[PDB]
Design an enzyme around this catalytic site. Structure first.
Site, PDB file in Angstrom:
ATOM      1  N   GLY A 188       0.828  -1.215   0.000  1.00  0.00           N
ATOM      2  CA  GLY A 188       0.000   0.000   0.000  1.00  0.00           C
ATOM      3  C   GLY A 188       0.852   1.250   0.000  1.00  0.00           C
TER       4      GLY A 188
ATOM      5  N   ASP B  75      -7.469   5.623  13.783  1.00  0.00           N
ATOM      6  CA  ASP B  75      -7.714   5.055  12.432  1.00  0.00           C
ATOM      7  C   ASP B  75      -8.335   3.654  12.587  1.00  0.00           C
ATOM      8  OD1 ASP B  75      -7.853   5.035   9.668  1.00  0.00           O
ATOM      9  OD2 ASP B  75      -5.754   4.519   9.379  1.00  0.00           O
TER      10      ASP B  75
END
Ligand code: LU8
Ligand code: LU8
Ligand code: LU8
Length: 284
Positions: free
Chosen positions: A17, A133
């Protein structure tokens, strides 16, 4: 005097990612997970390392820390080494797995347990921590059916932004009380409620189940913008859909009520992680 075995064999890449890469590795015959940070995401390594240098978190529902490693090259390489959970993320797991009542409750109570442990200040102990998060990709599934919370790269301790799809209304409308640590716990509880909705959809009742979808799949694009989210969550005040079939099932009826009490516009009205735990222990 003694050998310090530091070699880790990187065996397979299980994630790639903007953050960098996660690898299944091997140390001394044992699986470990190795996160190799991109230059983009170096601050996440520093923040998680500073947190673990402050408090060595140890909890069954928190991804287990092993090491933070910085190695000099002719660049700097930053590795975070943790426990390895071969079942992968909750996001992954819910795509290809439906749940019964016991497995659904076990998953969501384990997440609440991890989150309450982060949130609570313990004296003599740990500082209070907000994750910032929380989402299904940042939760791993363990073989024993419980989950653990991962990625403290944005975490803040008491004593950058999160994933937009999971942002609470006060983040999107910039009214969050940024000088007030409780604000960040309340942002986590909003995100927890979205995760509880993602999981509950995959619990079978009366031979019915919903397909896996991410929160707000029906009202925002893939990679929604900040404004896309603000319009849904703040201006129109939309919340995820609760299907009618849940109201035939006592577990899903109770979980619908809980997730509603994580999604109040007024952050101070939302349930605490400890209250969510207690409610979950009285369901079924
Ligand atoms: C530096 O780097 C890495 C090290 C290790 C690792 C390998 N063997 C032994 C150790 C060890 C632990 C603890 C002590 C103590 C004993 C008592 N004494 C008074 C103080 C010291 C000594 C040695 C470590 C920490 C693994 C790594 O990766 C998994 C490392 O790289 C990140
Ligand atoms: C980083 O991670 C791992 C490390 C190790 C490991 C290797 N050598 C020595 C140690 C050690 C020994 C002794 C003390 C203490 C005991 C009491 N007093 C005397 C002070 C010192 C501390 C540490 C460890 C913990 C093993 C691991 O797995 C089996 C690790 O996990 C991957
Ligand atoms: C979220 O964040 C972090 C996660 C991890 C982590 C730990 N255990 C296992 C995993 C994983 C393993 C395997 C799969 C797949 C591979 C193919 N298979 C057939 C299905 C499953 C997915 C995921 C990860 C990604 C480590 C981290 O740091 C070292 C993370 O960052 C803090």
């Amino acid at each position: 005097q003694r050998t310090v075995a530091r070699d880790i064999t990187l065996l397979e890449c299980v994630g790639k990612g903007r953050y960098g890469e996660v690898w299944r590795g091997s140390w001394q015959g044992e699986n470990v997970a190795v996160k190799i940070f991109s230059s983009r995401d170096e601050k996440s390594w520093f923040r998680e390392t500073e947190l673990y240098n402050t408090v060595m978190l140890r909890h069954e529902n928190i991804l287990g820390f092993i090491a933070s490693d910085m190695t000099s090259r002719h660049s700097t390489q930053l590795w975070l080494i943790t426990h390895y959970h071969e079942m992968g993320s909750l996001y992954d797991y819910l795509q290809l797995t439906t749940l019964d009542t016991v497995s659904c409750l076990r998953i969501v109570l384990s997440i609440a347990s991890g989150l309450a442990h982060l949130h609570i200040e313990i004296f003599g102990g740990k500082p209070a921590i907000a994750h910032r998060d929380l989402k299904s990709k940042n939760i791993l599934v363990k073989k024993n059916g419980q989950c653990c919370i991962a990625d403290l790269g944005l975490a803040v301790m008491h004593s950058r932004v999160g994933t937009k799809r999971y942002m609470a209304p006060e983040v999107l409308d910039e009214t969050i009380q940024v000088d007030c640590f409780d604000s960040y716990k309340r942002v986590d509880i909003w995100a927890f409620g979205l995760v509880l909705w993602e999981v509950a959809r995959r619990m079978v009742s009366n031979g019915i189940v919903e397909d896996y979808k991410p929160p707000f799949y029906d009202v925002v694009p893939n990679d929604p913008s900040f404004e896309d989210m603000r319009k849904v969550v703040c201006v129109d005040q939309q919340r995820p859909n609760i299907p009618n079939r849940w109201f035939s099932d006592p577990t899903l009826t109770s979980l619908a009520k809980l997730m509603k009490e994580c999604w109040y516009q007024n952050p101070s009205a939302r349930l605490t992680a400890l209250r969510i735990k207690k409610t979950l222990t009285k369901i079924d």
